[PDB]
Design a protein around this motif. Structure first.
Motif, PDB file in Angstrom:
ATOM      1  N   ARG A 149       8.045 -22.089   0.676  1.00  0.00           N
ATOM      2  CA  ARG A 149       8.657 -23.362   0.957  1.00  0.00           C
ATOM      3  C   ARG A 149       9.280 -23.843  -0.318  1.00  0.00           C
ATOM      4  O   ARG A 149      10.397 -24.358  -0.295  1.00  0.00           O
ATOM      5  N   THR A 150       8.608 -23.700  -1.444  1.00  0.00           N
ATOM      6  CA  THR A 150       9.201 -24.097  -2.723  1.00  0.00           C
ATOM      7  C   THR A 150      10.471 -23.389  -3.039  1.00  0.00           C
ATOM      8  O   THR A 150      11.452 -24.041  -3.454  1.00  0.00           O
ATOM      9  N   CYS A 153      13.259 -24.690  -0.297  1.00  0.00           N
ATOM     10  CA  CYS A 153      13.740 -26.000  -0.760  1.00  0.00           C
ATOM     11  C   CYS A 153      14.487 -25.977  -2.045  1.00  0.00           C
ATOM     12  O   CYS A 153      15.485 -26.706  -2.167  1.00  0.00           O
TER      13      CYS A 153
HETATM   14 HG   LIG Z   1       9.561 -27.618   0.054  1.00  0.00          HG
END
Ligand SMILES: [Hg+2]
Ligand SMILES: [Hg+2]
Ligand SMILES: [Hg+2]
Length: 754
Positions: A149-150, A153
């Protein structure tokens, strides 16, 4: 707001995009929707690159081609949608999940990451990938790692740090507008749900507001209902639909949450459903004249776009007051019921199917398309309806480009702004059935055209995308409209023509004057160029038939009328010879769009034209079109002075309609057309009823502070309705002086009393 609120929003977004909450057991349309979902997912899975150290995710998509990088990510989000749809074949399937995650991971590593600078089309990097990737992140939330997710994003934030802006830093960033603003904001809103970022979310929601603020020039929505994008292109039907779709989805997602859209000015957007979108919907299709470059797309058609608009309007209807909801639903029920050509449920998603079923369950009756005139002066577009037909005129001017091309799309569309006359009818496929693959782009219906071949992507003098013309504009009173276009030809040929249209409840009279060019080539005016599909539709004349042999042009008799089987009638209002050609044309979509298929489509056409010859001097034409007329009614059109040409020259063009008791005129220069005069450029329609005179007037340049009419039908003493100053001239005629400052081409309605 915190973790629980973000989980609820992600779940609402998954509900919306899967329809998982609204699938009806045993409903045959839902079943077909699940099949279509399954077939696509399977197609994508079978195309996965399974290799160690693969440099692509799919064997048929190169990450080094930005479009195919987008498709890589939409395939992945589709797979994730299917994986999350109850009853789908791959629902909850572990091997499929693994394949989606490896795809997202490898696409990131190889191509789409926070250390990569954009190469190629900005839209792919800032809109195409982020909306898909964000959806995938939200669908797969429970399964993706913190690291994943990092990274994802970080990639989206690298390419879209602020959705109020667009373009990579290397380019100078500009304010995002319209459809692009909505799409950028959507990507960030959904990414903000995956990463639980209220600051980014709130900024992105606030960004939506600009898109529905009225403008007076350039991109956006105008008070007359026009919608412009790409600065100078009428665009309600494609970009406007993107805007409409994204807002419907986002408003629904955020509604009754801590992030709900509460800007009270969004009423302007709701007003656009009837003010902007409905008038350019025709039996389920968005008019080609307002969809710019998308006409060149085999699989992004007027019906595709109309179906998207219907989905969006039904979704928005849920939140409206009862009367408005019902009106919108009745409009939609009509667009669906009349469209037997591309029925909305064929290939529909599960969400779309649910909304269409919901509509059917309300029992709301279909609303017919109203007869009459809807004018959009800010975008040089008009719509006109009568029983069985809709006319869409496509003009161009010093405000509105001849055409819009880019990215390999619509490079041949240079004549599409030259006064096209689209007659939409119960031949629902006229403009859809490979019309844009096979049509003669130099003989589009209604246009005046210098026969000089133009190159793909042609521009005007000094790179201009807009003609430096005198005016294009329109007015209407009751059943009759007057539309004018000073045509400046594309491609620097020096073509000039004064084209006007006088449109009643049944027949359209087309006048042309002052035609010349500098190229040395012959100039034509196209009465029609009409798709017959595979038909042999008869062309009937006073003398029998004409143009029976494909490829052999013939000239019409002195009967002056021709009827086309399956369409209606045409009649000449002057002595110009009419050339009639039955022709078989062929072409592939790849010929009009870099992405189009190579399959050759073959279509029959009827092509009717006037040849003004080489070196015309004040060349002219006058004809009329009677959609739906029988042979017998066509034979009668020229009898009994029903359609009276009052003037047709470089000063003014005017027609009186006998039965309608109404007269219409366009003025190019100060002068008289019969007993009506104008002090400068004008569109006028007038009708006397007893002791009252009704007038509609526009000042079509959009730049004059005043306009004075010399009134027809004798003396007038009082102004009952509207604004204006009566006077008398040297000859004893009544005059009406109008203050036209800032009118932006809009119509003034006036009623006078004797
Ligand atoms: Hg994220
Ligand atoms: Hg790349
Ligand atoms: Hg272009």
């Amino acid at each position: 707001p915190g973790a629980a609120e973000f989980a609820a929003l992600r779940n609402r977004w998954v509900d919306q995009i899967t329809g998982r909450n609204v699938i009806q057991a045993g409903d045959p349309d839902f079943a077909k929707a699940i099949t279509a979902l399954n077939n696509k997912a399977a197609d994508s899975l079978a195309k996965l690159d399974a290799a160690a150290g693969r440099t692509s995710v799919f064997t048929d998509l190169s990450l080094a081609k930005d479009a195919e990088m987008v498709t890589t990510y939409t395939r992945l989000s589709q797979l994730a949608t299917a994986w999350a749809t109850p009853t789908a074949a791959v629902f909850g399937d572990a091997a499929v999940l693994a394949a989606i995650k490896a795809g997202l991971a490898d696409a990131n590593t190889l191509c789409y990451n926070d250390r990569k600078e954009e190469v190629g089309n900005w839209w792919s990097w800032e809109i195409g990938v982020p909306r898909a990737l964000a959806d995938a992140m939200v669908l797969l939330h429970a399964e993706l790692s913190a690291a994943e997710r990092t990274a994802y994003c970080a990639a989206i934030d690298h390419f879209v740090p602020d959705p109020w802006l667009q373009f990579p830093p290397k380019r100078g960033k500009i304010t995002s507008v319209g459809a692009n603003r909505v799409d950028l904001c959507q990507g960030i809103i959904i990414r903000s749900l995956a990463g639980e970022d209220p600051t980014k979310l709130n900024h992105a929601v606030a960004g939506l507001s600009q898109v529905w603020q009225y403008v007076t020039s350039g991109d956006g929505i105008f008070r007359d209902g026009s919608f412009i994008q790409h600065s100078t292109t009428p665009y309600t039907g494609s970009y406007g639909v993107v805007l409409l779709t994204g807002l419907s989805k986002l408003f629904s997602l955020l509604g009754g949450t801590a992030f709900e859209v509460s800007d009270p000015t969004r009423s302007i957007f709701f007003d656009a459903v009837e003010g902007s979108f409905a008038p350019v919907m025709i039996n389920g299709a968005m008019a080609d004249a307002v969809r710019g470059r998308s006409i060149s797309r085999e699989a992004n058609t007027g019906y595709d776009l109309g179906a998207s608009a219907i989905e969006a309007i039904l979704l928005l209807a849920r939140a409206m007051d009862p009367a408005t909801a019902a009106r919108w639903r009745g409009l939609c029920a009509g667009w669906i019921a009349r469209d037997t050509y591309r029925p909305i449920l064929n290939s529909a998603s599960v969400p779309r199917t649910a909304l269409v079923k919901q509509l059917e369950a309300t029992g709301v009756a279909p609303v017919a398309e109203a007869t009459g005139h809807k004018l959009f002066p800010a975008m040089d577009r008009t719509m006109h309806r009568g029983p069985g037909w809709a006319l869409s005129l496509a003009l161009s001017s010093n405000r509105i480009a001849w055409y819009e091309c880019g990215n390999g799309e619509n490079n041949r569309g240079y004549h599409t702004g030259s006064g096209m006359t689209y007659f939409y009818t119960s031949d629902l496929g006229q403009y859809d059935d490979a019309f844009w693959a096979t049509a003669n782009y130099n003989r589009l219906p209604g246009i005046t055209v210098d026969t000089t071949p133009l190159p793909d992507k042609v521009e005007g003098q000094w790179g201009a995308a807009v003609p430096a013309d005198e005016w294009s504009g329109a007015t209407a009173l009751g059943e009759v409209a007057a539309v004018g276009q000073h045509l400046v030809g594309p491609g620097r040929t020096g073509l000039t023509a004064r084209k006007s249209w006088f449109v009643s409840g049944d027949v359209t009279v087309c006048l042309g004057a002052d035609i010349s060019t500098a190229s040395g080539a012959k100039v034509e005016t196209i009465v029609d160029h009409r798709n017959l599909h595979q038909g042999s539709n008869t062309l009937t004349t006073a003398a029998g038939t004409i143009a029976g042999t494909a490829g052999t042009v013939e000239v019409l008799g002195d009967g002056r009328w021709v009827h086309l089987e399956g369409f209606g009638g045409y009649a000449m209002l002057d002595d110009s010879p009419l050339h009639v050609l039955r022709e078989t044309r062929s072409g592939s979509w790849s010929g009009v769009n870099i992405n189009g298929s190579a399959t050759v489509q073959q279509r029959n056409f009827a092509t009717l034209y006037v040849n003004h010859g080489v070196g015309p001097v004040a060349g002219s034409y006058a004809y009329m079109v009677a959609p739906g007329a029988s042979v017998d009614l066509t034979r009668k059109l020229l009898e009994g002075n029903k359609y009276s040409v009052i003037r047709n020259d470089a000063t003014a063009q005017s027609v009186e309609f006998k039965t309608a008791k109404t007269t219409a005129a366009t003025f190019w220069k100060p002068g008289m057309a019969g007993d009506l005069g104008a002090s400068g450029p004008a569109c006028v329609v007038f009708s006397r009823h007893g002791n009252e005179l009704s007038l509609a007037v526009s000042e079509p340049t959009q730049k004059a502070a005043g306009l004075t009419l010399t009134l027809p039908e004798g003396t007038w003493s009082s102004v009952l309705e509207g604004a204006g100053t009566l006077g008398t001239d040297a000859d004893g005629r009544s005059t009406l002086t109008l203050d036209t400052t800032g009118l932006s081409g809009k119509t003034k309605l006036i009623k006078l009393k004797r």
